[PDB]
Amino acid sequence: KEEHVIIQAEFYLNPDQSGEFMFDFDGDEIFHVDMAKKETVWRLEEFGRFASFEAQGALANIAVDKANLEIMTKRSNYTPITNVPPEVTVLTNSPVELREPNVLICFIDKFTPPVVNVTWLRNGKPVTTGVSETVFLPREDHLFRKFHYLPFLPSTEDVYDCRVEHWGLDEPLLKHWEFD
Amino acid sequence: TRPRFLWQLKFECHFFNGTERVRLLERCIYNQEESVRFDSDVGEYRAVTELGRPDAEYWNSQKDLLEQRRAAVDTYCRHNYGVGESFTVQRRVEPKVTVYPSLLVCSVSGFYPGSIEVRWFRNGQEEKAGVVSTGLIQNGDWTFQTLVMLETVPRSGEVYTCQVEHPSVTSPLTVEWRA
Amino acid sequence: PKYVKQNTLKLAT
């Protein structure tokens, strides 16, 4: 008889020296901590008007996760993680209407480790203006989720592709979208 | 490239009916395989795989550690629930509804939370046969969307209506389409 | 209000 779930999720990956810390509420990121600027980044600004979180505290957990990863690596006798490729999907925020601002969403799901290269391509060429993404989000099977966004003006003349690179794929993955 | 090693830690607070029932689950995951966990309904750490036994044995041997964890349901879970209640458990964004041909498509987007009910009608009669949904889609920005299609060859004098029921609205939304 | 984190525990050595 389930109702709600709050998850504090953190990870540390090795060669990369990459770690993340975030809170989740029923699948959505409440906030995550940026290790570099040592700050709490709220998913929606409004949230940061009604709540706070001591970021330093996350830096502390990560330091311990660093030490734990090393201990576990040795305990498992340097057994590498097994790659699991992403499942990619591209869709828009709402129904598309020419001349009406919309947003392309590239959804990367069910993959690990937490390392991906994501490039938006408009008619073959890279697009970066306005783009944004989320941190690697939690999954119940412990794989990850990730979202990339591209605000855009629909047109009969433009084509879009979401390019995803992951150590689990043999070759880059291109997901296509176009006004029907 | 070269070998990767991953360490994941999850603290899951499960709430049932507000905070009348709360279950805390601490999970340690090495390379995607959970090795040891503390389940508030068990009361102590347990190994999930043989790799986690050392940790279960070690942590369970420290009276203070177990003490804090058993009270985390209150000092951690119930506390954080109250902190985001106003913008999480109570967040409400109404669905934008639009209907268009393709198949009759009822697009319900930008809504929160996720539980929604979409129904199709023909001349006042509910069409429960020949409906198709791509399921609830999480946009990852605290909004959902869904598409509920009706297999029909649109005809004249006929009225098609999409009815949407959602927590954000008092009286169901309806968008009708005719030809 | 302020969110509270849960401290990670160091593994057995």
Epitope: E54, Q56, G57, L59, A60, N61, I62, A63, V64, K66, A67, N68 | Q62, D64, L65, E67, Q68, A71, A72, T75, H79 | P1, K2, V4, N7, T8, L9, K10
Partner: T-cell receptor, first 112, second 114 residues
Amino acid sequence: KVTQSSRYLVKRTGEKVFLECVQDMDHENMFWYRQDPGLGLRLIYFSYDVKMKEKGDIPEGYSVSREKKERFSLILESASTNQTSMYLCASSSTGLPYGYTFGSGTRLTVVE
Amino acid sequence: QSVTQLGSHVSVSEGALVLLRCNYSSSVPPYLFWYVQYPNQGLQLLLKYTSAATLVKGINGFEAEFKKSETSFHLTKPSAHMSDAAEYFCAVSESPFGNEKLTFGTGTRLTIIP
């Protein structure tokens, strides 16, 4: 045990003073406080990990360094007399069921 | 978070009641600690409030009660002993175990009168 190199130090004003704190328990967290009458212990700086510096409640006049995990060095760029005090160092780990382990402390008097 | 220790110097005749004040400011679940610095030695944890119980019994005969309403955690002892002369420090933290940053009060020096 958390060891502080010296127990007493007499230094001259405008000089660059180094106070060391070395711990051997593999603790991720280390802190530097100063103890003064009627002021109790006040946090100068602290580190939760390697290369992590975080200004405490009274950073002014001090700098710090944590290149290695075992060592947290407190620095006084140009020592002033107001910095004459007893410095306590503490270490701990967020991953441990207990708290602070204090160091011997070092009396430091800076005169002109 | 903050702590205040009203009364920097407290005189108490032995056999008499020892009361060392401590009030705190915490926008979060409080964890308080009482440290003692006996003459010629370092700070010792006397007792700590980990939210387990409200009346915390410490070493060397000391007691402390956490009053969420008064926002206090005063230290008491029915009969002052001469060896109780020392400086007492109150501390507050956000860590259940006191391993993340600690914020200390101004401290009180306790003198026992013979």
